[PDB]
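Reviewers asked in the last cycle whether our approach scales beyond single polypeptides. To address this, we selected a multi-component target totalling 668 residues and predicted its structure end to end. The input consisted of the following lines:
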Amino acid sequence: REMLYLNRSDIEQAGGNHSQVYVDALTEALTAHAHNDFVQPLKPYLRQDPENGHIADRIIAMPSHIGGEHAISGIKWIGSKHDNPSKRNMERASGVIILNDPETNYPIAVMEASLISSMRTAAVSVIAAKHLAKKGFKDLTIIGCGLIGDKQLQSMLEQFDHIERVFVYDQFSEACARFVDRWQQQRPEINFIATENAKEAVSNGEVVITCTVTDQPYIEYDWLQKGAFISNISIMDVHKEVFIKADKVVVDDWSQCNREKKTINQLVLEGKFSKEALHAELGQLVTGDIPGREDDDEIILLNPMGMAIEDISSAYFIYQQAQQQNIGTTLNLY
Amino acid sequence: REMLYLNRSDIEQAGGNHSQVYVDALTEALTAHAHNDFVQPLKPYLRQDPENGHIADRIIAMPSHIGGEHAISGIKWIGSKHDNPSKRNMERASGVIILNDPETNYPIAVMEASLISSMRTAAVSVIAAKHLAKKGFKDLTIIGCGLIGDKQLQSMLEQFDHIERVFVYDQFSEACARFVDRWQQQRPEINFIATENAKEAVSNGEVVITCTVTDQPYIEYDWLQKGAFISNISIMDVHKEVFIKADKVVVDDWSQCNREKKTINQLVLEGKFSKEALHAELGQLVTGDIPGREDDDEIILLNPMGMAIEDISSAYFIYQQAQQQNIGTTLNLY
Ligand SMILES: NC(=O)c1ccc[n+]([C@@H]2O[C@H](COP(=O)([O-])OP(=O)(O)OC[C@H]3O[C@@H](n4cnc5c(N)ncnc54)[C@H](O)[C@@H]3O)[C@@H](O)[C@H]2O)c1
Ligand SMILES: NC(=O)c1ccc[n+]([C@@H]2O[C@H](COP(=O)([O-])OP(=O)(O)OC[C@H]3O[C@@H](n4cnc5c(N)ncnc54)[C@H](O)[C@@H]3O)[C@@H](O)[C@H]2O)c1
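The resulting structure, written as structure tokens, was:
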């Protein structure tokens, strides 16, 4: 019995370094989600300090099974220390994805997780923007210049050739400076603007993507242009009023969002939100059960907690491409 | 950044093939358990058929962190298909353990899981028997001749040189036959008896270990000799009356046992059991907070759901031994 090991370099070589593989994988997984052909138990958070602990110091286990023609199971096991970049010069998040053959349940692949996690999260923004952003939008905003922001930006630019300007803000000015400098050279024909505050960045974006590590909301509803689509990838950035005031609120998975201690659950627990109030789950937009944007004045909020089936589908596509190209290291289980 | 990969062969070479490493690792982990120096979120079960599914068709995620001098985090991700041995000639269970450095949360080891899982489960029986079995017990019973039974038997014989006879039963006669034949040659001075039914095996054991895959209890209280210690490793074998009638009931972890849909929770939900009724958690016996066996007429039941800290502590000890011996395959994460 063997397993394929794919490090981040191997993942890049097998196509994991381009958005399209993730967009393809997620369109499939989200269709399976809409058709309920998956299983996704709740994610446990392992924290060393469940009391007295930074919200981004954790390891999350994210198991899932996707059914269908090419059923697959697996887990993403993804750790985080808020401190890693500033104190250790290391990426915040790290970890592994294990894929399992659903016939036998045996593990068949062990793969590095963080590039795939970041790219599938960027693909979530792409697919949602296809349904929820103004068609042909020109102005993109990125808040937070870490690995998630970098990939969000890369993928949007790969997937939307009409983007003209990119407003970028980070609380840490130097991170923003270097981020825009790097990108300005990567893409000379797009105009990147390092902004002075978040309000300037948010106010000027037709699509706004949050990519920070914060536990306190700063994005106000009146910052948002009519017609804006906000992909709230880092979840906590957005004031509650935005959930209430947006014309349409979309999540990836309601049961995961309407979960004890979370923003949506809190509005629900008060009498300020419900499932009736929710516009769609993302998969329902992909499959066409529910329409997306219907006019260009609508302000639309996506609040995606992240779903294990996204990681597992992404990793499975990449595993397959790697096997096709004989990329990776064959390990024996026994 | 690197991780050590240890396949089952590497684990054996690093000492993982002898009970003592597991006994040492678990004595440590169970002391940390008694002192509450750990974190162990509830295990999710991923099942393809949560409705219409065999109870042993699943993959379980088992994360934990152990504190102390050599704090460690990790996860056991362990799959099962009941069908694997009979239909595919494959071991029922399989999987991987990932170890994580708690300073950065980065993964540092990827290890095969099933030998370690089976051995740490055998160590649970050893440690409990040290506290709960009649001193110098001569007659051991094993029900179920798969990998768990094999390791339970190996470890008991390694750890208790006074065992004279071993009664063995399996529902599948041929499995029992070959099991005792193999062992009789491995240990010519011990007497192995293949029994005709479970009652004969259970009735004749001073320590009884359950190692089957069943969802229906068959072990009756009146089968048990006064003085017996039952290590109910496969959980479902034991009739409810035994929980009620045993002089002392011990679990590994109450919060895990007193969990919705489980035997103990059910007796609790009725008014037939409580935490007051429970004799000890295993760690409390190890640390001496609560006495073990106090006389030789007591009938004692251990009901251990299995704890992630056992796997993680075991894997960590083995990882360390392997590094000391330069065993295993160095992988690059990136
Ligand atoms: N929704 C999802 O499925 C999903 C998936 C993966 C990651 N995430 C989230 O993405 C976020 C970004 O992760 P990352 O790995 O890039 O982190 P990172 O540490 O690499 O970068 C975070 C960046 O945000 C900046 N920042 C922090 N607080 C800020 C604030 N209040 N305003 C402006 N800038 C701020 C930091 O200076 C840093 O440059 C994390 O919160 C992570 O949990 C969400
Ligand atoms: N408590 C714990 O922490 C823990 C840890 C690991 C495994 N387990 C449990 O150990 C059990 C044994 O696992 P395994 O990997 O050896 O399985 P396996 O399939 O290798 O073997 C099970 C054996 O039991 C026999 N059997 C099945 N039903 C029986 C019955 N009703 N009476 C008598 N014999 C019967 C089978 O013929 C087979 O030989 C599993 O139920 C597993 O969930 C418990």
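Chain B touches chain A through 51 residues (CB under 8 Å). We regard this as preliminary and will revisit it once experimental data from Aim 1 are available.
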